[PDB]
A and B are shown apart, each in its own frame.
Chain A
């Protein structure tokens, strides 16, 4: 019935990353005294890494897909989706489905080694949060009105850039 499934966690939490970003995937599952190895799966395939956390120094498009893990005392985890994008700018989030009353933490991330200033976060084509530099947009209590298509906008260097849109739904 209810099994002790391992849980993949992203560090950082963003499931949408730009190419060249670092991503660490951690397996939340207990070890046994003899077997402290971790089973890591990528697109249903068992990869060589057997460490606690699967580290990606510079993400490529081949690193996208679903990841699952398992430890001695846990069960094969549910899958976690990792999307790798290529662009000057990107709207990041830990997921795209948020339960009502949960926090919505968004981040506007610019391409490797680029400055980002005057960040704006927009919902359904309307400006929602204005910053002078590049701050995350934190919404502590998700509501039904927080659902919509989001993107962030700013100056990458001196170029005014808008990110791709992202749908966010809130379940009641």
Chain B
């Protein structure tokens, strides 16, 4: 809940797999919630904001991803919260698409 005030920009191809999966999740969560048809393409850029506490610190991902909407490639901004208190797959881990907006 309480995050560090700094927001780190993720250099090119750092955490690419974790980030590319969180992007797909974000799209899938958007399509499920708004019954949309967006098709993921790639992550453009990513930022990370880290939780304050010592153990199992959550991360807040600010993702800029490209998705196809009826063939039209468009940019979107995804905000995803991830707090893993145990090694996945476990139901104690939380993953939530908090915001999904176009650009």
Interface residues of A (CB under 8 A from B): 118, 120, 126-136, 138-141, 143, 145-146
Q: Could you say which residues of chain B place their CB within 8 Å of the CB of A140?
A: 4, 6, 8, 50
Map CB proximity to A onto B9-32 as digits: 1 under 8 Å, 0 otherwise.
Answer: 000001101110100000000000
Q: How many A-B residue pairs have CB under 8 A?
A: 53
**Interface set, chain B 53-67, CB cutoff 8 A to A:** 54-57
Chain A interface main SS type = mixed
Q: Contact check, A136 vs B4: say whether CB atoms are below 8 A apart.
A: no
Q: Of A126, A132, A135, which is within 8 A of B55 by CB?
A: A126
Shortest A19–chain B CB gap in Å is 22
Interface residues of B (CB under 8 A from A): 4, 6, 8, 14-15, 17-19, 21, 48, 50, 54-57, 84-88, 93
Cα–Cα, bound, A132→B86 (Å): 10
Q: Contact check, A130 vs B87: say whether CB atoms are below 8 A apart.
A: yes
Q: Contact check, B15 vs A130: say whether CB atoms are below 8 A apart.
A: no
Q: Contact check, B86 vs A130: say whether CB atoms are below 8 A apart.
A: yes
Q: Could you say which residues of chain B place their CB within 8 Å of the CB of A132?
A: 18, 21, 84, 88
Contacts A139-B50, A140-B50 hold; do A134 and B87 have CB atoms under 8 A apart?
no
